[PDB]
């Protein structure tokens, strides 16, 4: 009621460790009779099988390079500001596009960059409703010392296919050229994310680390001969499991914030003359003028033993 | 003095019986209820209105109302 509406959001690039790659496609080897003798690779590659309707296969040229099961974002946070039962909604967009700018060492670290020229509204990845204390999770779990809260905003199948396919094809394109898939090559496939607040009044989350998982399907393979393992239960066709690679913002890449105060209210409060404010998030500072000349005139020849300045406040 | 409740605090009290009949003629018709000032209004689609009035105030006081409805 004194300062007006405060609103915040952030932009973040995702890192990729040097040489990170997805497991190679599973490839059979057969002798002249057609009987399988050995195999290499681990990732599921064969379609048309009703057992593989759980994933989407992805390609370059006319060859299948792998599969995508899901893509999911976790925004981990230790703490927050404000009420913790007000319902809020959050939405996330992919950075970059035709004619947009990109984050760099000069654009970032100012608290009032305009995100509308870093991203395009049609590249929405997903949305989530949240409460900063998630009562959907049982108290028994939320009491654990290993529990860190997060908002989990996993994508729809079409978006998951697009993003995961781009990342996986970039990784393959780097590997096939005997390069290594450093973060600058990842940034060509997925520029970053913009996180925006649509609805809700009261919560400000302190997102500590945004994290993205890319999930895929793999066979289990024999330790000596490399073939697929058969399922140990009755019936069955083959043994498979799901695995993932992780991409996160880890201080080797750029992250920026928009911290928007209500400008007219701030400008009005700066003009009060009975008092001074100290509004912290890029708001108001207070400036003091020391009487150095008077000290230099009146106490020349003295040894100064203490010079005390005190600022004091209302409730 | 050992002070003890005479009725359970966090319990929705409906009473033994409904406090009044529905005043609308041809009860198949659509219904709507709304409050205005110190009256509760019940509207029916066939241009038909019924009403009842609320006492002076203070929700914690020993109020009784709703047993009578007027056209």
């Amino acid at each position: 009621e004194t300062f007006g509406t405060y609103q915040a959001g952030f932009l973040a690039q995702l890192n990729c460790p040097d040489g990170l790659t997805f497991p190679e496609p599973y490839k059979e080897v057969t002798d002249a009779s057609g009987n399988v003798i050995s195999a290499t690779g681990r990732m599921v590659v064969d379609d048309k099988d009703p057992e593989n309707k759980d994933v989407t296969f992805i390609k370059d040229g006319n060859q299948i390079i792998g599969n995508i099961r899901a893509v999911e974002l976790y925004l981990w946070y230790d703490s927050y500001f404000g009420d913790s039962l007000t319902a809020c909604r959050l939405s996330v967009y992919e950075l970059g596009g035709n004619g947009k700018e990109t984050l760099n060492l000069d654009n970032a670290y100012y608290t009032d960059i305009n995100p509308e020229d870093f991203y395009d509204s049609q590249n929405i990845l997903g949305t989530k409703a949240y409460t900063a204390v998630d009562l959907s999770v049982k108290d028994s779990i939320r009491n654990l010392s290993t529990y860190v809260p997060s908002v989990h905003i996993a994508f729809k199948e079409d978006i998951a296919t697009r993003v995961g396919g781009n990342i996986l094809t970039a990784a393959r394109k780097a590997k096939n050229a005997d390069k290594e898939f450093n973060s600058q090559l990842f940034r060509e496939a997925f520029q970053g994310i913009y996180v925006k607040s649509d609805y809700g009044d009261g919560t400000v989350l302190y997102i500590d680390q945004p994290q993205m998982n890319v999930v895929y399907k793999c066979y289990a393979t024999d330790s000596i001969t490399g073939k697929k393992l058969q399922k140990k239960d009755g019936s069955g066709k083959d043994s498979t499991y799901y695995s993932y690679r992780v991409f996160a913002t880890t201080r080797e890449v750029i992250q920026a914030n928009q911290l928007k105060n209500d400008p007219e209210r701030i400008d009005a409060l700066i003009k009060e003359d009975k008092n001074t404010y100290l509004k912290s998030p890029a708001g108001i500072f207070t400036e003091a003028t020391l009487p150095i000349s008077d000290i230099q005139n009146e106490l020349t020849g003295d040894t100064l033993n203490a010079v005390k300045l005190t600022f004091t406040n209302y409730n | 003095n050992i002070r003890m409740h005479t009725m359970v605090p966090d319990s929705l009290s409906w009473g033994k019986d409904p406090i009044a009949n529905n005043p609308v003629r041809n009860t198949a018709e659509k219904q709507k209820v709304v409050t205005l000032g110190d009256k509760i209004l019940l509207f029916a689609q066939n241009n038909e209105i019924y009403s009842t009035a609320i006492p002076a105030g203070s929700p914690t006081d020993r109020l009784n109302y709703g047993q009578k409805w007027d056209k």
Partner: protein, 188 residues
């Protein structure tokens, strides 16, 4: 043993002779411009007994953004024990542990202090493996001797004796070998 443990120089000499490695004095390193040749596997004999090889001096097009006081530096590395030839510490990706996502996702980050004497550094963020295994925040002093000789995004290889190692290497008197895949100025 008290003084017998200072025979780490025998193990370092073993580790040198086991591989193709040549030793260059600093007075020669600073006079053939500045490079340890990789075809000949050169290493410089630095101060306090550190042996160091620059594989990429870093930031070759800009050439100006060197390290300095009050910087925060991100480190990615893999640590090899000299006495028993074993990979002991790392925070980088390799296929042999590719699915262990906890080990390599986050780097180590330290503040660099370079006042008129006694250069030292403190970890702000330790990597998961270091944070669980060694649990101490003091940077190996051998690393800090390399910063004045390299630039941003440099790749260097170091042999570090016990006198300038970390809180375990100083007690159990064990030299180590570090393959520093990258020094970076910290962003965000």
């Amino acid at each position: 043993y008290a003084e017998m443990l200072e025979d780490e120089k025998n193990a370092v000499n073993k580790f040198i002779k086991d591989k193709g490695i040549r030793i260059i004095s600093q007075d020669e390193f600073e006079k053939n411009d500045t490079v340890t040749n990789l075809e000949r596997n050169e290493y410089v004999a630095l101060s306090d007994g550190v042996y160091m090889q620059i594989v990429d001096r870093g930031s070759a097009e800009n050439k100006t953004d060197t390290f300095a006081n009050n910087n925060e530096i991100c480190v990615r590395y893999i640590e090899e024990d000299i006495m028993t030839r074993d990979t002991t510490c790392f925070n980088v990706f390799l296929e042999e542990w590719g699915d262990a996502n906890q080990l390599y996702t986050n780097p180590a980050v330290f503040r660099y202090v370079a006042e008129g004497s006694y250069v030292y550094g403190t970890f702000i963020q330790m990597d998961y493996y270091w944070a669980s295994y060694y649990q101490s925040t003091a940077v190996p002093a051998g690393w800090l001797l390399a910063l004045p000789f390299v630039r941003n995004y440099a790749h260097v290889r170091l042999i570090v004796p016990s006198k300038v190692g970390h809180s375990s290497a100083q007690q159990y008197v064990n030299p180590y070998y570090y393959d520093i895949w990258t020094f970076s100025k910290a962003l965000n």
